[PDB]
Design a binder for this molecule. Structure first.
Ligand code: UGE
Ligand code: UGE
Lengths: 9, 227, 227, 9
């Protein structure tokens, strides 16, 4: 599962 | 970094990100935090980007080494996994120390306080990923407690489309699924967060809509993986 | 790494590569070289992979920072470019020191000696990429001299399809084009190397053919870029 | 221009 990335990309 | 100006540390953190020098970026942002002033929104993102990338690389390496070690069921693989694990724990302890001295206590606006408590939950979650046994229980509870305080503030003070509120819920749902052995809680939180954001998108500008829908898609991607 | 066994350093360098921990990998291989024994073919490749990756990341960051600095035509961009440059020079000096103490002097077989002299040319070439002015002239000549000695041995002792001979010629041709301002020499070397390898492919097994043709394609890719 | 990679990949 994915957590929030550091930047929008 | 005590002899470097705050503004120079910030500028160099931005340069380090452009150069993909994330260890440097984290050291510059640690120096900036240690100047003792509060961080702006942009500066908070620099701090989070830097450490998330550093610890993200350590986590990926720890997972490679842990898989080799488990397949092996000499001492070298365990020793090297332990070395990487200790370095990872050190970086998490550094971030947690910055949050505790004194970013959280000085953060009064909802946006800053939720941001820092979300980070606190994240770095305890990374400690929990490598922890075993009992202290593991207390580390898990420390992550839970930080995320829960951030959730309580976010629900009272931010709209359901706010990107920090959304990212907090995303990460707390990952905590429930991957750390706390609560997949139903993870799914419920992701679904409720998604649906309540969907119902508030009509209030947003094009640019805010793009930000909220991006994180909504991350929630949906997890829901697709989990269901 | 003086207290760690040679064989443990080698094993940990292999693990570090699998975990994409190239700084660790280079430190393990430096420790292994400093045990004082000669390196096998596999160990030479571990040493080269580790440092090529470390310096490759430094070069990429230096290029990003140098481009920002040139576009700018405060002191922060120059200071940070200088920091990265000093770190890069330090790693190159470390590799050159390992080659000089004492890998090259103990390397008697053509394969090992050419390998180390090719590395010596490469690390002087990386120093030349960031050098200015006069000491720049001597650094360029040090790269040239190392590559030339390696070329002389390779032409006498290895077939024209040998992958070390081919990679040496590839890198020396890059030196001519990018460092020595000799694009015609670069093109001539790449073409002659390619053609002489092509004429010797008939002698090779499937596996050797695959290795030689891979590097031949790299020579051709450069020739396409340069012509 | 490309120089030799560390591994065949
Ligand atoms: C935890 C967190 C959530 C959102 C943000 S942000 O400033 O709104 N932003 C930058 C980081 C990732 C991102 C993805 C999608 C939309 C906005 C963002 C920061 C931190
Ligand atoms: C400088 C050099 C050239 C070849 C070799 S290798 O051991 O033959 N090998 C590994 C590295 C890259 C490579 C590409 C294609 C074919 C073989 C190789 C090592 C060093």
């Amino acid at each position: 599962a994915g957590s929030i990335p550091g930047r929008r990309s | 970094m005590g002899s470097m100006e705050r503004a120079s540390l910030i500028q160099k953190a931005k340069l380090a990100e452009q150069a993909e020098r994330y260890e440097d970026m984290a050291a510059f942002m640690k120096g900036a935090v240690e100047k003792g002033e509060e961080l702006s929104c942009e500066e908070r993102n620099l701090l989070s980007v830097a450490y998330k990338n550093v610890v993200g690389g350590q986590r990926a390496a720890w997972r490679v080494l842990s898989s080799i070690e488990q397949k092996s069921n000499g001492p070298e693989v365990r020793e090297y996994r332990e070395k990487v694990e200790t370095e990872l724990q050190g970086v998490c302890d550094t971030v947690l120390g910055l949050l505790d001295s004194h970013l959280i206590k000085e953060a009064g606006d909802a946006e800053s306080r939720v941001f820092y408590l979300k980070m606190k939950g994240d770095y305890y979650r990374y400690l929990a990923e490598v922890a075993t046994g009992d202290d593991k229980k207390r580390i898990i509870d420390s992550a839970r407690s930080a995320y829960q305080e951030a959730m309580d503030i976010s629900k009272k003070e931010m709209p359901p489309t706010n990107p920090i509120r959304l990212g907090l819920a995303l990460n707390f749902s990952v905590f429930h699924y991957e750390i706390a052995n609560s997949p139903e809680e993870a799914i419920s939180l992701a679904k409720t967060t998604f649906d309540e954001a969907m119902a508030d998108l009509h209030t947003l500008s094009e640019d805010s809509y793009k930000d909220s829908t991006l994180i909504m898609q991350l929630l949906r991607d997890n829901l697709t993986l989990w269901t």
